[PDB]
Design a protein around this nucleic acid. Sequence first.
RNA 1: GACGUUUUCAUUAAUCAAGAACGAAAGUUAGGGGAUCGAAGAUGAUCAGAUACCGUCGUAGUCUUAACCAUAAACUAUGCCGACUAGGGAUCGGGUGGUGUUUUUUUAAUGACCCACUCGGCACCUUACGAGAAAUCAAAGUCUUUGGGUUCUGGGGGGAGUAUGG
Lengths: 48, 87, 206, 115, 220, 129
Amino acid sequence: GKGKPRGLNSARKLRVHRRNNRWAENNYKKRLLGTAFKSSPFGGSSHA
Amino acid sequence: MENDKGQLVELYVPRKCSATNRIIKADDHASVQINVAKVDEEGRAIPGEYVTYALSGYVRSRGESDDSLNRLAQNDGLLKNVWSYSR
Amino acid sequence: SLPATFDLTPEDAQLLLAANTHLGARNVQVHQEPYVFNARPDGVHVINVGKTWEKLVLAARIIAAIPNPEDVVAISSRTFGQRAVLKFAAHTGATPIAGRFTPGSFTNYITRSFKEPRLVIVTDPRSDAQAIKEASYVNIPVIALTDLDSPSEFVDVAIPCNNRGKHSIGLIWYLLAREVLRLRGALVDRTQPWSIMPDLYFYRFP
Amino acid sequence: GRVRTKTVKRASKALIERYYPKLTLDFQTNKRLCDEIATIQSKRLRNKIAGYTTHLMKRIQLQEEERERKDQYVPEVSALDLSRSNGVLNVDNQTSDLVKSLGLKLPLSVINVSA
Amino acid sequence: KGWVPVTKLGRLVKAGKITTIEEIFLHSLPVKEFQIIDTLLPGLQDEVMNIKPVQKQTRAGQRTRFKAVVVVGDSNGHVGLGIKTAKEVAGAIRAGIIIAKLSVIPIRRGYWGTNLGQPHSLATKTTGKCGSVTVRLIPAPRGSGIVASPAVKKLLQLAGVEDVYTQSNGKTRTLENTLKAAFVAIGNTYGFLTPNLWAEQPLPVSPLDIYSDEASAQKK
Amino acid sequence: TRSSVLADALNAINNAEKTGKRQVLIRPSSKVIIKFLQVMQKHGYIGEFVYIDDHRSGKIVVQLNGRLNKCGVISPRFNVKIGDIEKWTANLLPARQFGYVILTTSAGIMDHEEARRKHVSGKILGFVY
RNA sequence: GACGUUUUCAUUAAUCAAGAACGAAAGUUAGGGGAUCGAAGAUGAUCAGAUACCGUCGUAGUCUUAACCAUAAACUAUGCCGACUAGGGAUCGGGUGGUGUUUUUUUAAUGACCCACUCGGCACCUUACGAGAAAUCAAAGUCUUUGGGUUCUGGGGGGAGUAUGG
């Protein structure tokens, strides 16, 4: 069954499933917490 | 298989298995071509006119190599009750 | 197919039943019931020997078709038929092989013991272990003999007999060789004996 | 203890194989034979050939006749018949059902431990 | 010279009984010695992929082996791949031509959605695999050229193709596995039962029945 | 549990054909599977088959000629528009000029090109060759 | 639990957020004995770190009673219900008796057997068709020829199962 639901009502799971596994990706968590804005002394710039 | 006007494509028009009805490729290192010359009255050979068999690779590898050729000798007119149709 | 020249006859069944090949092998990996009929009441299998005769009927169709008698090869690592192949050879025209099968015989086209066969008849396809394994590279048919524990792998002509007693092997060797020489053509029938004995192809005790 | 000249042991395969009794144990007359015929161009190193192949005479004191052999010799009254068992044989009860069920003519004697 | 003919197939070819190349493929023949396909087809050319200096220790101080990977072929549907570690640069170069003449087999390549004067692309999506590398070829429209890695493109030139859409996967940067995998991938286009290959073959004769008196095993 | 009998169909014929048989005994079976196999016989990827019956589920015996390489259910049984069947072609079919996904629809059961011919498109069932 | 049944329900079903039982060893409160050894410890060691392995007594503990805990290499390192294939001589739990062989119910009774046959548990090894990177695996298969159903985890190494909070 390859560890996942498939049936055509289960999308409720799946877009909540990947929603909790994007945080294991690195630049996703780097991006969507404003860590480039709370740190990185350019402050998201390109020069200073 | 054929172009805008016909003209069949891709030389080495291959030959086929007669046991699993699969194909025999020019790679293959198990496929055997069998020339069964006939018999007749006086019962010798008639060498040259052949019941040509071909045996591919999966049958010869995975017990079922032998009984699959009993059927072909039966159902062509070569042997009698060596292959139980009522198996 | 089966001509009026030859089919099942009870005068060559003199020979096979005189060898007692109702003594087959005693336990059967299950690929080996087109040719058994029953077993004696302690469980040793009885052979449909008329179909074992049809085996040699098509086995000679295989042999006599080739316009090259040099292309006939017979292997015998089991000691019993090691005479028999020579007993075949100068009779038939097959090049004889007996003893140890040299590892990489059908491999290594450079070395001395490299044969170019078009047809190979084996004798004991367990004792001819790397003659079963390493022969199906250059696309060769495997004329074999098959007791009830003998390989259904890599074979196509499973001739049922025993290999316990020197008479069975040379017996079926002689029963094929007689009509191979008669497919090449000397004599006719089956109740008719050949000029030389079925005793001829058998094993001495030196 | 010693291994002298090694091109000697073909003495029992070159000269002896047609001419057996040539050599002699005493050595006062057996050494003229090796000067005329060969490229042996010495006087002292020459006669080392007898003693290294004298020791080969201590084991003693063509197979193509075995393919036409194989159609002549035969015991004419042998066990390759229905004769020494007098035809009737101890045969299985279902082999009698086999010569039934194929069509064959035999004598069928049956021994049994029960069924 | 000539061929000094061995293995009953040089005995065919040195006289001249087999004319074409695919005649040998037609019967699924064995090939043991190697210059047969170059006699049968002079159009091939030696196209080196890589000659890399491996210094594996030969037990007393390494004397500079070389593993060459040579893809021989004409760009007309006759390929060949040879891999050999040898003791010389030019020795490994010639050794890579030896094995690449043993390893010859063509590719059934066709059209894609129509037909016109000459075929361009493959017949079917195939895939070969060598341990670490998967190679997944795809049929292509007219003209679009070889979409492949810089090693794969020259081998598929010698396949005779003008257009492929390769979609390989795996640890491709071991370039020894990759061409083995892609050679499996091109060695399957005949070995795939497609609905155009649905006819019943008659199983015709072998020429090793025919020629066997004409120019065969000679004792003399 | 045999949640899809249509799935514990042809997987059985995978385990027959890949293991090299000429038939298999399918039990249970439905009119889903019966018309599925009538469609497959109409295409002739598989050969002749027979429904034998009990006062239970029922059995099917198939006599093909090899050309069934692979089939499979595409569960869950997705619902497809007209233009979107051709999406499902190029994902999981060998070439353009053969090969059939088949469909259950309110016009019964037929492959996706008879859907293109008789001008509907419905729920997926499987891919067959 | 298995097995037999031409007994009864006629879909009562699979897993599983939440929720609930149980739980080695060790450990945790209040008691019984207190025989056995014995993490700590109190002693003798005993010569440099041939190396500190030795030895002797040992509170609690080991054993239990009214209760926790909720931890393992809790590992067959493989969640649970499906499908088929190998190929085998035995096993054990059941079912059967060969003009079937003997002590003796009286040739095959109590029991047990050769030859066969069935479903339950524990296993083994073959060629590996299929895999895997590989050791190996009859399932770690039927997955690039990618979809029988369902649940929990992983995203380079560390920092770190650390801080913080519930």
